[PDB]
Ligand code: HEM
Ligand code: HEM
Ligand code: HEM
């Protein structure tokens with residue numbers, strides 16, 4: 001509605017450890033596989049048929065990082081994510097036609113990929129900070145649908 | 147995030163026609179019957195066993211109106227529902243322990259009872275204004291859970 | 293699971309709809325689009341101007357699949373099969389949305405059967421629509 | 434519906450849990466309470482201080498019902514019957530919440546099998562947990 005400094009110091013350092021290019025190819029990859037109807041917006045992309053063809057598809061790997069860098073950058077204006085994503089929101093509604101329900105779906109695959117990567121370092125209290133973040137990002141990306 | 151004047155003029159007049167005491171005994175009554183696990187917070191109340199024993203139970207009829215009048219009054223500060231319900235929110239969390247998911251469930255039974263009552267007068271555009279209202283009320287009632 | 297008091301209830305309520313069904317079906321949709329603009333994204337190729345044949349046509353199609361489902365309430369999964377196949381693989385509408393159209397339908401029905409819409413029936417109907425939503429969401433993953 | 438590649442996957446992932454299960458089960462819960470304080474309302478009689486035997490005990494109970502479910506993945510509804518009866522009539526936890534605990538479990542598992550947690554397995558597991566959630570939500574209305 002927002003965050004405690006112990007919160008934000010938290011998502012800030014876990015993130016300085018993240019290799020964005022590779023963690024993004026992973027969440028977008030797993031989003032397509034666990035919730036296969038997200039496949040929906042991407043047959044411009046090629047072989048999307050077995051969990052293996054997808055985790056290895058380079059177009060997936062690429063937009064995966066495009067998305068995540070779009071996100072790394074908002075980590076920086078945690079104070080007004082709505083202002084940070086207003087243009088990307090207008091665009092996903094008016095031109096891409098993405099059910100914003102997907103931002104939530106991806107927000108959750110991402111908390112999952114972060115747990116996989118950092119194991120015990122990703123403690124319940126650190127997840128909570130990121131559940132707040134992922135939720136606020138999905139919320140700001142959807143602020144302008146109509 | 148809020149409302150157009152054509153919106154608010156709309157929920158305002160449909161409501162001047164509502165007999166609160168009787169429309170509230172109805173939605174709370176139908177909430178208990180359609181989503182029977184809401185029964186959960188009320189066996190201080192008696193026979194809650196057949197759809198007929200419930201729509202006729204007077205304790206239900208009573209708190210039904212208590213709830214709805216609590217709501218009629220917020221129709222008046224549509225501008226800051228969060229400030230209007232902060233005390234009722236703190237109370238439903240700290241003392242009553244109600245899964246706020248219920249406010250949404252009741253918000254929807256209520257749009258339904260309004261459609262039943264006003265028939266064709268309750269047009270898609272008028273429902274939309276009230277979906278905004280019911281959603282903002284559920285949102286303000288939950289603003290303070292922890 | 294639908295009890296049989298449930299089936300008696302859905303059959304009798306939908307019987308009163310009889311032929312206004314494509315009509316109630318087009319109305320449900322207008323209400324979904326206006327009340328939950330988010331559902332709009334699955335229809336960029338439609339003219340959603342109120343009264344356009346595109347939506348009037350889709351609603352007769354949706355009300356008809358529903359009538360077919362009420363006619364087969366005991367063997368529903370097989371009856372809505374090709375449709376489960378459709379939404380699941382070509383269309384892929386996120387399931388959070390079936391909950392949404394299901395509700396505007398509950399609402400469109402509440403506003404037209406001043407009173408066939410009994411609380412006991414309001415319940416069997418929400419229940420019936422949740423079953424249809426589930427069969428259609430079934431072969432997704 | 435769980436394919437059988439799904440069952441092979443859930444059986445092998447939960448096998449690695451074997452005995453840390455009451456442990457992973459108590460951790461899932463702490464994460465639900467912290468990440469979704471709203472789930473707290475079903476537990477006013479618990480001390481949710483981190484490490485309290487009340488939550489450690491509930492988690493062994495929850496992980497155990499889960500182990501029993503994986504052992505009966507083909508006859509699940511009958512196996513989780515008394516439990517479906519429980520939550521449904523005494524407890525009555527709103528079903529929106531099964532989606533929540535299901536996710537913290539997905540997450541607790543992701544953080545402990547550095548890598549048994551394959552994307553293909555991450556999928557069968559989300560899938561398995563949604564099935565358990567559905568059987569338990571079954572006799573509600
Ligand atoms: C984490 C939240 C997300 C962020 C921050 C994000 C950001 C972006 C950005 C910056 C672009 C480039 C837009 C441009 O061309 O200027 C983009 C494109 C796109 N995104 Fe989103 N995205 C997110 C989630 C999603 C989700 C969940 C989906 C679908 C499930 C999606 C599907 C797409 C598609 C299809 C494109 C177009 C790519 C193309 O033109 O080839 N994005 N996204
Ligand atoms: C439309 C949103 C709602 C509003 C505005 C509302 C308002 C209120 C108010 C003003 C009270 C009296 C509190 C006091 O004693 O001072 C109350 C009590 C209560 N409400 Fe809420 N309520 C709402 C929804 C709900 C829902 C959805 C439930 C359960 C599903 C619920 C369950 C209760 C219970 C159990 C009490 C205590 C009654 C008693 O002490 O006997 N309310 N509500
Ligand atoms: C009550 C549940 C629903 C039923 C029974 C239903 C039924 C149908 C039927 C029968 C068709 C046409 C099939 C054909 O062409 O042969 C259709 C098409 C379609 N439906 Fe579903 N539907 C339901 C819910 C939804 C929802 C929630 C959405 C998402 C907002 C949706 C989006 C679509 C779309 C995009 C089409 C494509 C129609 C076209 O090609 O123009 N439907 N639906």
Ligand code: HEM
Nearest residue numbers: 472475476494495498499516520524526530531534565566
């Ligand atoms: C993964 C799905 C779940 C499983 C397998 C599960 C299993 C169980 C089991 C086995 C019990 C004890 C039964 C007994 O006493 O014999 C229990 C109790 C309970 N569970 Fe469920 N549960 C699940 C999800 C939930 C959810 C989502 C909630 C709501 C937040 C919840 C709330 C409770 C409560 C309040 C109790 C009472 C325990 C007590 O008496 O202290 N459970 N659960």
